[PDB]
Amino acid sequence: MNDLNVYGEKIRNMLLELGIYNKSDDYSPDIKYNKTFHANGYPITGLYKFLGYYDRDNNIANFPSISFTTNFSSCDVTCRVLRSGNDRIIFNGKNNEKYYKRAEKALSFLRKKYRIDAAFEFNIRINRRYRDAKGLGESAAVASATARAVAAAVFGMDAAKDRGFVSYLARHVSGSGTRSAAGNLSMWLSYPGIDDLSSIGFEIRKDDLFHFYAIPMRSRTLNAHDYASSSIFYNAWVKSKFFDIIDIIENKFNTRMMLEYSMKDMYRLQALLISSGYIIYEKHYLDIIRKLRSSLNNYKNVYFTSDTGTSIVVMSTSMNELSRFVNDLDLDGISGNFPEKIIIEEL
Amino acid sequence: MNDLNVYGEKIRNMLLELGIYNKSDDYSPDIKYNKTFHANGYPITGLYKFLGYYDRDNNIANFPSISFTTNFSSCDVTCRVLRSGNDRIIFNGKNNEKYYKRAEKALSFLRKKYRIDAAFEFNIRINRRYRDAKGLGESAAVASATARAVAAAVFGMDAAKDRGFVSYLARHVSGSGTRSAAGNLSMWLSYPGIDDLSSIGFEIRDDLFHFYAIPMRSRIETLNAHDYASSSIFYNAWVKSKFFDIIDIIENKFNTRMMLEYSMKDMYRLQALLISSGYIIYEKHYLDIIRKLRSSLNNYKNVYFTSDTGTSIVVMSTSMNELSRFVNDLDLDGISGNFPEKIIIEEL
Ligand SMILES: CCCCCCCC/C=C\CCCCCCCC(=O)O
Secondary structure (H helix, E strand, O other): OHHHHHHHHHHHHHHHHHOOOOOOOOOOOOOOOOOEEEEEEOOEEEEEOOOOEEEOOOOEEOOOEEEEEOOOEEEEEEEEEEOOOOOEEEEOOEOOHHHHHHHHHHHHHHHHHHOOOOEEEEEEEEEEOOOOOOOOOHHHHHHHHHHHHHHHHHHOHHHHOOHHHHHHHHHOOOOOHHHHHHOOEEEEOOOOOOOHHHOOEEEEEOOOOOEEEEEOOOOOOHHHHHHHHOOOOHHHHHHHHHHHHHHHHHOOOOHHHHHHHHHHHHHHHHHHHHHOOOOOOOHHHHHHHHHHHHHHHHOOOEEEEEOOOOOEEEEEOOHHHHHHHHHHOOOOOEEOOOOOOOOEEEO | OOHHHHHHHHHHHHHHHHOOOOOOOOOOOOOOOOOEEEEEEOOEEEEEOOOOEEEOOOOEEOOOEEEEEOOOEEEEEEEEEEOOOOOEEEEOOEOOHHHHHHHHHHHHHHHHHHOOOOEEEEEEEEEEOOOOOOOOOHHHHHHHHHHHHHHHHHHOHHHHOOHHHHHHHHHOOOOOHHHHHHOOEEEEOOOOOOOHHHOOEEEOOOOOOEEEEEOOOOOOOHHHHHHHHHOOOOHHHHHHHHHHHHHHHHHOOOOHHHHHHHHHHHHHHHHHHHHHOOOOOOOHHHHHHHHHHHHHHHHOOOEEEEOOOOOOEEEEEOOHHHHHHHHHHOOOOOEEEOOOOOOOEEEO
């Protein structure tokens, strides 16, 4: 779309003027064969949420998104590049066709764009702080950790330390990986017609953030993109996203505005899914959201959100108000924090 | 440049060319003072659903709608016109402000348009086949019954038997009233800028369907749902798609199967509009029933279901035997529906 491109480009110019965004630099492969590289990565929770791709082959989104990086789980990846052989993708000790299929797609991009004739061995470890739950942004943790390990092995440590370049690589695994690779509070710039190296994540800041807590819940995510995109309301959502992104940039990413927006956006996201016949709502989720909504008026600056799942993230600018809310409502979840250490190393 | 008025006028011309729609005829008052008139009226269930008004004072909707008339409740109205005296509006034995206000908005239109200097006595009786359920189109039953009684008393039996004219009067009580007054399967033509006597209900038809309701309790009042849906950021996209969907159903000659399937899709879209504004229609029991219904639909041939601005569900089928087999297999605890067979309009 031409009007969407115009608004995307306006957003890009505003970000270039702020100095927080730059088109990513590109690198030439200099493969360190037979050496194991290790990297970690963290999941994300959406504030300005994302659903639907403009170009699903390159993972270009229809509009920009904003998330924060959490510690609800952690991913660690081991990568080894071989001159010959077959790719091996191990996920939590399992060698299943499902994981292979998702990996070989980002590796296809890598081999075609950079003319690489090599085999890849990946060992992915995700440690969750919950037994089972959806919508806690696990795919962003895998995408950022795999991108960091591949960047170190294929391009070198200099490239692996370049957050823009690593977000570019992470995007090819999962769109949300752009924001996990970039930092703790980050934005992914994306819109129709954007150049490949311009559609990346970048950090907004590492100060004046907030407190958060998750209520992990079971739900009956790649289908969420198709379901939302096919909604008759999808184009109206995409259009409003450009105006909302412009407004948050003009408001200098004010914390409380983003927290409030994330609550409104949770409802809009659910509405898009509902309008396509996908009911995200489960009985237990309904009981918790009614409890949460009913009590919000009695708290100051307490907000909550959900993504494509029933897990809820409760957020507040005050740690005491958050803990008071969690205790009074007897919520049984996990305390969150922004990760402090990104590891990228040759083993 | 009003795009909704353009698509509205295109729809109107298509309907004129089919010969199923005509601008309503108007009538001069010839009041039969001191005589009691009695009429009945029935609720509706939306197929091409309606929410939000373009002009709330004249009850002009933003787009056209299609519904069917049911027997989930019934309304009976008694009307008497007096030369002098005061208006009296009794609703289920109650004389409350909320009812006087709703009746006065319509009577003000009647007195101003037709230059009537008279008092009106209305006695409205609504008998429901459920307790506390929402979204079963009760306001259409009151609107059609009151319009039939007023048309007989104020304009005469000839005007009361003119379904177009009666739907025009019913619109001033409740928009959905146009469809209830028009017949069992009907469309209300409405869009921004439409002429007053053109915004009426008309009967589509012969080859209908069977239905069954599961009345359920809900939080959101139908009157508030108009404001809630209208305030959604998705409302304009819904309105726009409604014009294209109405053009498509007219070109498909109101095919039953297509309208039943549309009503299922439209139920999701309606819920989405309410959800996007932060209004959750869902309840735990509704969730359990809709999951049971959705899970079994693939095993039935012509079975569909819908809901309006409530948790009440209406199950529909082109076959009575398939519907009863569906209701029995899922052990549904609701009420059997039927299209009303007798419309009463009488003096005394
Ligand atoms: C031109 C026709 C004029 C006649 C107008 C009179 C009709 C309006 C009266 C009452 C509206 C009733 C709406 C339904 C009430 C439900 C309220 C409840 O049950 O609590």
